[PDB]
From TrEMBL, chains A, B:
Gene behind this protein: exoS
Binding, GDP: 45, 86
Compartments, as annotated in UniProt: Secreted
Residues shown, of full length: 102 to 235 of 453
Protein name: Exoenzyme S
Residue span(s) of domain Virulence factor YopE GAP: 28-97
Amino acid sequence: KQMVLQQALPMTLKGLDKASELATLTPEGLAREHSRLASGDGALRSLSTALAGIRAGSQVEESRIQAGRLLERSIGGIALQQWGTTGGAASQLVLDASPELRREITDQLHQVMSEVALLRQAVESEVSRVSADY
Amino acid sequence: KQMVLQQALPMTLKGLDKASELATLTPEGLAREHSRLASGDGALRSLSTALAGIRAGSQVEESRIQAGRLLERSIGGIALQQWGTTGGAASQLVLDASPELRREITDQLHQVMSEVALLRQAVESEVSRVSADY
């Protein structure tokens, strides 16, 4: 099931794309769409799903470690990878969070996206290397 | 890592596509390209990789069981899923196989492809159901 995770690396890029809003998410914006941007097609779920795909499917060790660091990084005390849940601790944390934790998780999410931008360059070129003759 | 296998179902279809030659592979043809059609972009590897992706990533139980039955089905005594290996027991079996085992594995591979054609209808519509609004 290894090689299958690898054959899906391409899909990873579209996940990263659907996560762009997070690069400028504002403290007030998180409060409002808290929910939405966390499920379905939400930025938060797409980001973590994409990073999990890079972590499982890339053949470049640096890309796997980076994607793993990012999924485990705590966003307001909770790991980025929890933030993509349909009504978990993330959804409530937001309502119950305060103008303090909110600027915090927002700043953190912005930092993730700039590291994601480097990650994505490496992944893009692995996807194009893997599929040259295909 | 569940949801990630699911987000890749789409890639599965392209694997099934790269496997079409197998639907009419002839006994003499297997003997010749034995190798090639078993690695890299080969039909055999693409088929098993695709079926493994449907088995892990589909949310339709019938599709997972079918894909699993097909990966485990023996093709000349060896499981379809071994046939996609770069120099294993499949590659040699062919050279060492005989006009008897060769018509056999060929007939079997044809039967797989016709079942794959049903499988692919279900998967296509799950991929399109999953991504309507996306």
